[PDB]
């Protein structure tokens, strides 16, 4: 995954600019202290040295013109401009060293041709910051050459023009090399920043981000502070290619807007062609120029632009038009020139009957010309965090593809479409692992297969395309990547020219609709059904007539027979069929193109083992075509192998099932028959044995033979059953009905036999009578145990069973009761748990008493004969504590129960609170200390009518969380109420602000 | 001495139980084959028959429920329970017949009201041995009735509960009569002996000796074998009166100890009140309950308990306390329940915060409850041989009186006092002559005057007290019998309420110090001093003002004069005074109350005869006030009757008398005066003659007048005396000195005059000189006779008298000698008797010879001049026999004697 790359010789010698020779493919890198020439794959050929050199920016004129008194420092020479002069096979390189002098280098060896340094203007600027200077070379046929150059000046407004045109004579040894194109007192090919403007506003300067030639004009894109937080303005500056007087100078703001965000800070730009979608969107020819630009949100933070940034497009035509309209309105006498930083003041437009042509190049009046109304671009794409930093674009197959660098070293691939979407990112590559921001200069290899991209530390050759990353025709043709098509027979996503035989029928899909799927019939076969002929159909296929082979996973590959989009193939033979893990086994059935040699389509093919099913219902309900052979008692794929035609079963409905009856109750140790009902029981055929019932009891499994009366009924013979443990009274046991030794009849309901021993579970009379009347299990007095009448001897007629329930059950006892203590006021909910209580609520009611005190029981809370929940009444009585009494219904001497331990009455009290004070909002953890705090059922804590949130309770303390004082700050009462008792006290709680 | 008694109709139909109706006094006896109703004095009114009936103990259910296949025998119906149901005027009687069915009988006629017999529990037990079952009826006001019953079960642990509570409805015809108070599978008003316990130990059983209700509880006292010789344990079993579930069941051992003996085998018991002494000893109110119990020594021999047995007392309060402490420690989780025969095993107590009140009636946990540490009683009394067999008690005048039966038919009356003594037996009655043991059931008549006591053959009504047996105030009030006081005027030991007028002054003595006594002055009178007034004082007397009479033994009864406690009476008159046996004569002087008619006090009164004394010394030394009248020569009580004031003698010192002098020697036929000495000789007064001396000689009594020189000396005048006979040389004669004719002066020494004759007695010279030197009688040669110098003429100076004894005598002769023969060897003691031998031994020694053979005489054996005892020397000499020779001192020719017959040697 590694691209060709070139690193800087040193960590401080950062890269600045980059250009590729359109004809040679030679790569030129403008760097600190170095100008590099490299091969296509970034192998260095020449390293031209440009620094460092001792210098001082205060030294003006430079050391090469004058000796300097200032102290010198070894200074880095920043590349500030790098431009190929194609006509003259040379390269222009200008550094920051010595006030910004320039060099001309020969392309092949970078040998210095000349270095103009005697005239004042031969020094461009002392600024040592990149992204502030840009140049454009313009040389027609009959002209020797011209250079337009714009630069920040660093306040040295008298040292350096901000924009100017220079001579670029074909002859390197011309004395006028880099001289002003025109230079007189009041008419020169240059613009100077007025002294008054720097005085008014500093650090006022003009930064030249980008420049280009289009038609009969040159264009510069600038950023500069605005003139009366610091606000900046991004502008388009236009000049005619032929205009020594600079009378054609005109300057308009520009930017773009989307989704309520104005993007006004220019970051980067690139001239390209529209592509079909934008050409239509802009109403222009497909070979007209479009300006692609990056802007950051707003008009502030020039040195650290907002991450929120946008890619925008400006048709050159739309720009020229807005410029013409401006010229026209001005030459009609409307408004002012509106360029304060230069004109210094308000200057009114002068009306003059001059026709403003498309190629109007200005006059003496109405120039230079500014303007306030911005040129609006079409916003194509925006990001919120990974700030866009660079841009390059080109047209592939009518699609405008835009490459956008990011501050984190990512490269975005945007496909440009007009409204309403604007642009779509179809890929983002991670180019620089160190996360270094992508610099402005990006350039294509001569045939646009690669895009050269740079960071401060690195130049990297990035493939325009990585289509191979899409592994299905679907992914490939829906990626949105203009370069990517589907190479059908090679099963590969690639460029058309990368797909072999792409020009032949259906070899290359350019549209999702031109993609494949594979249909097989049958889509599954019995494992025993080998050497089958299968019918394969290829949807959306190309010519397969060259030949097709079928691959059954790893198992097999046989030559298929081809007729159109239909393929016929023989399935694996006996030796080669897969083995099934114990019902089926899937694999990918694949077609290999004989034309290309590549597998290009696939689909799942499954082998099954009807034999895997060994019960009728299982076999029948298989997902695959299986048949149950009634008599042969097996599952098969081939119905003709059943013993008789009558033996074939296809649906579960007629599978020889057991129907349910009322619950099967079986006592342990008693001889009983178990009649069963069922449906479609088979008559055992020749060589087949009869029916048995198998009981799956962990302790012991019993095998009892049975007789099948008819299709509907069965019956195990008289036998007794038992299990060891005596742990559980009611044990349900799964039973399986088998015939012929191992054929188990299906049991959908999963009917089970309940083996009961009369209470393993119930030690008490109340529990037995509680249980089902069905069991017939009942309590037997003498044993003090519980079993059926059969099981218990009749000394007398009495063994007792709850007839309807009208059976009283003696000797009630109380094990333990909750809420040991309680408040004297009462209201407490006493929870009494006993063994042998009354069966009905109505009897227990009025039964309960705590000593003298009457207690009223609660119905819902009352669990028969196990537990009684009762509410105590008003206790102010003589005794401190008293025992609890239960009277089953009559307070007979046999019939009463007394508690082992006695219930104690008290009266809880509270002395103090851990935090006395707390905030009005509340939420304070209060700790109230006292005595007998634990008593009773419920607790409610009260501070100033609004309740406290309870947490935990203890004998000693109660902890709760305070409510907001809905009240005002100050003292508040604390009321605590437990049940019926409400206790109050002098300790108070103070709410604080 | 015979009490009211009732005998059994038959020798085999033994008595079993006994109860007395507190209100009617009706006596009900539970016996074999009979229930008897009797009157207070044991006269039979109704005899209700209960047997015999054909039966077999193997027949269960009984014949009245099921036909039996077992062979039947005519069976005796033993009374096993007999209880009066006071609320419902009926009686509960349960026999051994038919597995122990019960009957209810109407009190008045013993007509059967009902006989529960359809339900299993209606049959109590097949045991046919008495003293194994006991019941207690408990019926408050709002309840219809309840019966607690405990019984031995005879191993039929599934047939019969050992302890249970039953319904006793007021309505006799109730269908639930004698039904369990509560009956369910695992909760019933009953305790059953576990099967495993009988298997482990047999013949394990529980015997219920006694039962009672006290406060809010019922109590049963049991004996049973101990569980791992056979050791038995006696226990107190307590239950709350109201507790159908029997959760209140608790059981502790009990007994008592004294003098290194543990009494642990329960024999009998009885609930009573303490009496003051025990109430203080036990620190309880005098109306709290006390359990009186009999125990035998040790914990073995249940069927024949040791004779060594004890009576003990247990305050109910002390019992309840020890039970509470047990409950408390258990409900604190300490130790086990400790009742193996029932629980079967070790069961740990369960700690639970339950307050144990005085009236705690148990819960489900920690019950039934046993224990190992015994309840110790206070030992009141013990016996070693007559084994105690029964007990009953009550309080009389603050004294706890305990009645204890014995195996030999004796009834002991014990007075209970606390430590250190414990109890004191103040009486033992023999109740049954046949020696039959006293049975357990004893009961008081309604007013506790009698105690009904029974043997197997007999019911006897025994008086609580028999105070009349004490016949003197002293015996009565020192018997130690709380019932007995002294009824002064009736001279009777009795109960206070039995003494007439007991509420009047001094009529009833409750203390020995209050015993009457009688003082008389004078306490003795001369017999001649008749019709005297005497002053009688009655100490500790009651009002005598009704009248008093004095009785002088049988002799007299005269009306006395009464002033307070003083009585004055006239002594017997001349005709009626007693005669004295020859100095005095005592009799009982008695007072008879005119109010009651009874003699009630007495004291000794003596009559004397100063006249009875007839010698001065006798009269003077009398124990009574007598005076000797010197001149009138008589003893008197009245000194003013002496002749002269000078005649009165009061002390013996001046009783006049004749004093002795050297012996008075009087020769016969010689004129001699006899001077005498004496003391306080009286001067004869007017009309009185002088003194004479009278000699009392049988032959002749001589009267010689004498002169009294002074108070000290007398002398008979010159006269000669003689007596006829010549038989005895020395004749002492009593002499009496008389004056005034017949007044004889006293002679204490009884001085006599010796009349001696020169030898009437002695024919030989040796005998005279032998006699007293005093006589002066001596031998006179010429006469060949013996008389005084005066009597024999002196031809010459020679008449011979043994000077010192150095006088040789003449013509010795030998009459006869003993040991005629002798051995040649010698050594023989020769006894020679002669007439006229030597006076001294020293002369005779060396005198004696038998022929040639020397013979040595013996000093002690030698009697002067009469006999010589001599020892012969070695005889082997020539002669066979030889004559014996005596040489008085010198072998003079006149001086030698030769034996008439000769001594022979052989």
Swiss-Prot record, chain A:
Q: Give start and end of each Sema domain.
A: 1-464
- GO process annotations (BP): cell surface receptor signaling pathway; centrosome localization; cerebellar granule cell precursor tangential migration; limb bud formation; neural tube development; pharyngeal system development; regulation of cell migration; semaphorin-plexin signaling pathway
UniProt KW keywords = Cell membrane, Coiled coil, Disulfide bond, Glycoprotein, Membrane, Phosphoprotein, Repeat, Signal, Transmembrane, Transmembrane helix
Q: Does the keyword Methyltransferase apply?
A: no
Domain IPT/TIG spans what residues? 812-905, 908-991
**GO molecular-function terms, A-Z:** identical protein binding; semaphorin receptor activity
Bilayer topology term: Single-pass type I membrane protein
Residue ranges, Extracellular side: 1-993
Q: Relate the assembly described in the record.
A: Homodimer. Interacts with RND1. Interacts directly with NRP1 and NRP2. The PLXNA2 homodimer interacts with a SEMA6A homodimer, giving rise to a heterotetramer.
UniProt family annotation = Belongs to the plexin family.
Task of the protein: Coreceptor for SEMA3A and SEMA6A. Necessary for signaling by SEMA6A and class 3 semaphorins and subsequent remodeling of the cytoskeleton. Plays a role in axon guidance, invasive growth and cell migration. Class 3 semaphorins bind to a complex composed of a neuropilin and a plexin. The plexin modulates the affinity of the complex for specific semaphorins, and its cytoplasmic domain is required for the activation of down-stream signaling events in the cytoplasm.
This one is known as Plexin-A2
Per the UniProt record, the source organism is Mus musculus
Residue numbers of the full-length protein present here: 36 to 1039 of 1894
């Amino acid at each position: 995954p590694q691209y060709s790359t070139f690193h800087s010789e040193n960590r401080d010698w950062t890269f600045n600019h980059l250009t590729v020779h359109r004809r040679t493919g030679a790569v030129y890198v403008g760097a600190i202290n170095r100008v590099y020439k490299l091969t296509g794959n970034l192998t260095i050929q020449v390293a031209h040295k440009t620094g460092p050199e001792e210098d001082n920016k205060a030294c003006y004129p430079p050391l090469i013109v004058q000796p300097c008194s200032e102290v010198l420092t070894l200074t880095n020479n920043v590349n500030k401009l790098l431009i190929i002069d194609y006509s003259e096979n040379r390269l222009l390189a200008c550094g920051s060293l010595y006030q910004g002098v320039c060099k001309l280098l020969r392309l092949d060896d970078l040998f210095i041709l000349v270095e103009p340094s005697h005239k004042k203007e031969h020094y461009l600027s002392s600024v040592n910051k990149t992204g502030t200077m840009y140049g454009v070379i313009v040389r027609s046929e009959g002209e020797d050459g011209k250079l337009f150059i714009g630069t920040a000046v660093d306040g040295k407004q008298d040292y350096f023009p901000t924009l100017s045109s220079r001579k670029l004579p074909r002859d390197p040894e011309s004395s006028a090399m880099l001289d002003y194109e025109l230079h007189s007192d009041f008419v020169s090919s240059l613009i100077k920043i007025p002294s008054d403007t720097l005085a008014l506003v500093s650090h006022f300067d003009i930064f030249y981000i980008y420049g280009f030639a289009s038609g009969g004009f040159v264009y510069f894109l600038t950023v500069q502070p605005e003139t009366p937080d610091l606000f900046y303005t991004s502008r388009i500056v236009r000049l005619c290619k032929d205009d020594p007087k600079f009378h054609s100078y005109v300057s308009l703001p520009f930017g773009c807007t989307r989704a309520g965000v104005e993007y006004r800070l220019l970051q980067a730009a690139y001239l390209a062609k529209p592509g079909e979608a934008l050409a239509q969107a802009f109403n222009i020819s497909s070979d007209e120029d479009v300006l692609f630009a990056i802007f950051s949100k707003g008009q502030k933070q020039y040195h650290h632009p907002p991450d929120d940034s946008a890619l925008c497009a400006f048709p050159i035509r739309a720009i020229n038009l807005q410029i013409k309209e401006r010229l026209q309105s001005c030459y009609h006498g409307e408004g002012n020139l509106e360029l304060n930083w230069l004109l210094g003041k308000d200057v009114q437009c002068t009306k003059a009957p001059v026709p403003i042509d498309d190629n109007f190049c200005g006059l003496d009046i109405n120039q230079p010309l500014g303007g306030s109304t911005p040129v609006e671009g079409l916003t194509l794409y925006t990001t919120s965090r990974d700030r866009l930093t660079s841009v390059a674009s080109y047209v592939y197959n009518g699609y405008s593809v835009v490459f956008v660098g990011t501050k984190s070293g990512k490269l975005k691939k945007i496909r440009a479409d007009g409204p309403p979407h604007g642009g779509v990112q179809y890929e983002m590559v991670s180019v620089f692992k160190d996360g270094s921001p992508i610099l402005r200069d990006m350039a294509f290899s001569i045939n646009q297969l690669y895009l050269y991209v740079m960071s401060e530390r690195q130049v990297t050759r990035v493939p325009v395309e990585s289509c191979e990353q899409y592994t299905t025709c679907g992914e490939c043709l829906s990626s949105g990547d203009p370069h990517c098509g589907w190479c059908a027979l090679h099963n590969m996503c690639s460029r058309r020219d990368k797909c072999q035989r792409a020009w032949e029928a259906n070899r290359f899909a350019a549209s999702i609709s031109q993609c494949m799927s594979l249909e097989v019939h049958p889509n599954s076969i019995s494992v025993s059904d080998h050497s089958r002929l299968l019918s394969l159909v290829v949807n959306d296929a190309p010519n397969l007539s060259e030949g097709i082979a079928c691959a059954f996973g790893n198992l097999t590959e046989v030559e298929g027979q081809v007729s159109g989009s239909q393929v016929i193939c023989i399935s694996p033979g006996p030796k080669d069929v897969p083995v099934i893990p114990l019902d089926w086994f899937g694999l990918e059935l694949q077609l290999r193109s004989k034309e290309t040699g590549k597998i290009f389509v696939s689909t799942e093919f499954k082998f099954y083992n009807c034999s895997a099913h060994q019960l009728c219902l299982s076999c029948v309900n298989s997902a695959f075509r299986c048949h149950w052979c009634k008599y042969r008692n097996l599952c098969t794929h081939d119905p003709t192998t059943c013993s008789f035609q009558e033996g074939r079963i296809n649906v579960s409905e007629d599978c020889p099932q057991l129907v349910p009856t009322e619950e099967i109750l079986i006592p342990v140790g008693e001889v009983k028959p178990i009649t069963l009902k069922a449906r479609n029981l088979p008559q055992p055929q020749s060589g087949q044995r009869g029916y048995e019932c198998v009981l799956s009891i962990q302790g012991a499994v019993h095998r009892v033979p049975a007789l099948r009366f008819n299709s509907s009924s069965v019956q195990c013979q008289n036998s007794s059953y038992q299990y060891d443990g005596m742990d559980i009274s009611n044990l349900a046991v799964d039973f399986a009905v088998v015939w012929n030794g191992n054929f188990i009849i299906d049991n959908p309901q999963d009917l089970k036999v309940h083996l009961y021993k009369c209470a393993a579970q119930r030690e008490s009379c109340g529990l037995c009578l509680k249980a089902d009347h069905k069991f017939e299990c009942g309590w037997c007095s003498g044993e003090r145990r519980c079993t059926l009448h059969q099981h218990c001897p009749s000394t007398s007629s009495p063994w007792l069973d709850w007839s309807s329930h009208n059976v009283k059950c003696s000797n009630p006892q109380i094990t333990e009761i909750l809420t040991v203590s309680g408040p004297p006021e009462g209201g407490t909910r006493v929870t009494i748990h006993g063994v042998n209580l009354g069966l009905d609520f109505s009897e227990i009611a009025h039964h309960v008493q705590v000593a003298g005190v009457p207690c009223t029981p609660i119905p819902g809370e009352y669990i028969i004969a196990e537990q009684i929940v009762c509410e105590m009444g008003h206790a102010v009585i003589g005794t401190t504590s008293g025992p609890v009494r239960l009277c089953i219904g009559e307070c007979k001497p046999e019939f009463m129960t007394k508690s082992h331990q006695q219930y104690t009455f008290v009266n809880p009290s509270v002395l103090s609170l851990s935090p006395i004070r707390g905030p009005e909002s509340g939420g304070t953890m209060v700790t109230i200390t006292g005595h007998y705090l634990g008593a009773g059922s419920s607790v409610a804590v009260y501070l100033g009518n609004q309740t406290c949130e309870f947490y935990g309770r203890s004998m000693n303390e109660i902890v709760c969380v305070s409510p907001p004082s809905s009240n005002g700050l100050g003292p508040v009462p604390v009321s605590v109420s437990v049940d019926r008792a409400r206790v109050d006290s002098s300790l108070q709680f103070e709410y604080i602000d």
